[PDB]
């Protein structure tokens, strides 16, 4: 895991990853909408059988 860590965990800090997600989701500066879109997506798409 040290590998994966070294390639991405070194480049991406915290909470910015969410930005990269809502990023790919919504192309066009929406700060609010980007973050809330990504947040919406994590909860409503990722293993929704878990919550």
UniProtKB/TrEMBL annotation:
Which domain of life, per UniProt?
A: Archaea
Subcellular location(s) of the protein: Cytoplasm
What is the purpose of this protein?
DNA-dependent RNA polymerase catalyzes the transcription of DNA into RNA using the four ribonucleoside triphosphates as substrates.
The record's family statement is:
Belongs to the RNA polymerase beta chain family.
Subunit structure comment from the entry: Part of the RNA polymerase complex.
Q: What is this protein called?
A: DNA-directed RNA polymerase subunit beta
Residues represented out of the complete protein: 257 to 307 of 1123
